[PDB]
Amino acid sequence: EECRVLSIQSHVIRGYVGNRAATFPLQVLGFEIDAVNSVQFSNHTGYAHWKGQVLNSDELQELYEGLRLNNMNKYDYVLTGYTRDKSFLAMVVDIVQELKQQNPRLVYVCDPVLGDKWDGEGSMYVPEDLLPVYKEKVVPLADIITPNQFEAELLSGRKIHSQEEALRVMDMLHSMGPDTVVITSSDLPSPQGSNYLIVLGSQRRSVVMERIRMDIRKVDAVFVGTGDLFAAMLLAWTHKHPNNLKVACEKTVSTLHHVLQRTIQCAKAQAGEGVRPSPMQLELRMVQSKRDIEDPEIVVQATVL
Amino acid sequence: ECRVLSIQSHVIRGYVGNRAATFPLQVLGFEIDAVNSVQFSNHTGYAHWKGQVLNSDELQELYEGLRLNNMNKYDYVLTGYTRDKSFLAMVVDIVQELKQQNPRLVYVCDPVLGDKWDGEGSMYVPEDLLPVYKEKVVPLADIITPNQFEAELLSGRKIHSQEEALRVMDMLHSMGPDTVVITSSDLPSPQGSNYLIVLGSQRRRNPAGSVVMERIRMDIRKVDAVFVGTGDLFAAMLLAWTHKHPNNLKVACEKTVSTLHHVLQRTIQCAKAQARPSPMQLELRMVQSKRDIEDPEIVVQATVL
Ligand SMILES: Nc1ncnc2c1ncn2[C@@H]1O[C@H](COP(=O)(O)OP(=O)(O)OP(=O)(O)O)[C@@H](O)[C@H]1O
Ligand SMILES: Nc1ncnc2c1ncn2[C@@H]1O[C@H](COP(=O)(O)OP(=O)(O)OP(=O)(O)O)[C@@H](O)[C@H]1O
Ligand SMILES: Cc1ncc(COP(=O)(O)O)c(C=O)c1O
Ligand SMILES: Cc1ncc(COP(=O)(O)O)c(C=O)c1O
Ligand SMILES: [Mg+2]
Ligand SMILES: [Mg+2]
Ligand SMILES: [Mg+2]
Ligand SMILES: [Mg+2]
Ligand code: NA
Ligand code: NA
Secondary structure, eight states: OOOEEEEEEEEESSSOSTHHHHHHHHHHTTOEEEEEEEEEESSOTTSSOOOEEEOOHHHHHHHHHHHHHTTOOOOSEEEEOOOOOHHHHHHHHHHHHHHHHHOTTOEEEEOOOOEEEOSSSEEEOSOTTHHHHIIIIIHHHOSEEOOOHHHHHHHHTOOOOSHHHHHHHHHHHHHTSOSEEEEOOOOOOOTTOSSEEEEEEEEEOOOOEEEEEEEEEOOSSOOSSHHHHHHHHHHHHHHHSTTOHHHHHHHHHHHHHHHHHHHHHHHHHHHOTTOOOOTTTTSOOOGGGHHHHHSOOOOOOOEEO | OOEEEEEEEEESSSOOTHHHHHHHHHHTTOEEEEEEEEEESSOTTSSOOOEEEOOHHHHHHHHHHHHHTTOOOOSEEEEOOOOOHHHHHHHHHHHHHHHHHOTTOEEEEOOOOEEEETTEEEEOSOTTHHHHIIIIIGGGOSEEOOOHHHHHHHHTOOOOSHHHHHHHHHHHHHHSOSEEEEOOOOOOBTTBSSEEEEEEEEEEEOTTSOEEEEEEEEEEEOOSSOOSSHHHHHHHHHHHHHHHSTTOHHHHHHHHHHHHHHHHHHHHHHHHTTOOOOGGGGSOOOGGGHHHHHSOOOOSOOEEO
């Protein structure tokens, strides 16, 4: 009847990040997703300016309490992403634990947002005290995690220089609890050329492993909200294709392809030839990608490792 | 691209305020930015509900952020249930500046003041809001959607018949808005007593330059239940379909009212099959009505007045 998702992420007025990047897509795919907005900002922090207010851990608990009092604390999935506050994350953990006791079959999709790699090596953009909570509290509770290379390294304590090392680090994260690990981006080399980024996916489930790889053509620009979109779409596609990590990843990545393809085109037309599109011009063309989200044309086959 | 700034309430579970208005508008291709005026666990018609509210200062701050980035350029502004006078005054100042930034901006205002329960009607917003609506908001509005009780409060006249309704509608036009739709009333229907009546009136200047007025009426059969959020959805869709059929109120209203019907029908059937349906079972089945929102099959035709 209904697949409900409790998604606790940022909200911006203008643009598509966090809950803004996750909601429309999931609703379009028929999920009863409920959005708890961890913050409400004018726009994402990639802009010259930004304003807003946050939601403290007490307010989050207050909201959970209202749902519980009405017996609306039964969800099929929980989805979380970027959080800057340690208190908030701990409160999130208590909530998932609770929702899990309420429904053992709940799937927690955790995007362990900690930072990223830029030119070569990267940096965190979350207070460091958060990492221990993610390693000790969050990830062990998670059923599906979506870190990028940097986050996978931080959560494992191991550096990743090759595909093999990435799969080993993924085995470590698996042992930490999550049955599905998908590294959403990395510096790994591709035979296709230098203009590619690699996605690796591992799923434990007769206990069998399924591992995949995808080589994605890089678009010349920095997008915001794509990691969030990736996690939400992975949530939707692993849902329709359980035990088929391959397809789930192909639909997720293809959906990202169409959205970004549509986004970079508009960004240019607006910026004009030879001019790099601004963050504003680079906002995901989300509503215009509705048909691509409903049924994405697979434009990337994933290789079975 | 058509940009809408919608300042209304947000709930975690259910569809009212920005939750009733956002998904449908996005489905229709509108770039709608949602400013959440409150964040509650659910709508206040449930046994319990908890949450926080946005104050006029935070609204001003969120707006300052859009402005600092030059993102205060909108085609439409949509407001609904507002609980605080200083908030409403802040909303008024915002709409003024936006209209200055763009003189073609259309302000769609749902002047939420109260309603009628059986025979008697009463307010559910601070009474000190009525003067602000009368002198500050409605004069800035291009499209208003009051229910019968609100048209009466705004006009200062009681409505006992179609004739009195049309006079208050002209009164409302003279206050400001070119489009006045009374979204519900207990006026008499030649089809029975179990009908609510919708009246619409739109003043526009045709190609030749003559100022004319289109007037319509719809007799909707009442369903046995109280829905929350349908008034919000009505305004949202009215915005969407008058945008599509700017010189045809009859069609705009027929698509708006037909969309509610399809939604309410699906909702009433997946509430009966659950049960009396409680507030939770009567939540608008928003996500499941996607197809109906995109292209509503017209099920009720309007009477030309
Ligand atoms: N410049 C780009 N070119 C092509 N695809 C991109 C680009 N940026 C993002 N993507 C798409 O978005 C996905 C996620 O990458 P991103 O770098 O946006 O997230 P992450 O950094 O992997 O996630 P997060 O920081 O939220 O944990 C990539 O797998 C790819 O599908
Ligand atoms: N019980 C019902 N039976 C049939 N249709 C209904 C019913 N309730 C709401 N509707 C639909 O929703 C529309 C809006 O009515 P509602 O009473 O929901 O809002 P209002 O009270 O008219 O608006 P507001 O938000 O300004 O108070 C009606 O015109 C109709 O299309
Ligand atoms: C507050 C906030 N939410 C969401 C996002 C989206 O993150 P990503 O670019 O990985 O999709 C960002 C990006 O930094 C952010 O700052
Ligand atoms: C915060 C809020 N938003 C929206 C609504 C829904 O209004 P309506 O049923 O007139 O569309 C309500 C109900 O009173 C409400 O409390
Ligand atoms: Mg990245
Ligand atoms: Mg992110
Ligand atoms: Mg009503
Ligand atoms: Mg309302
Ligand atoms: Na990621
Ligand atoms: Na109304």
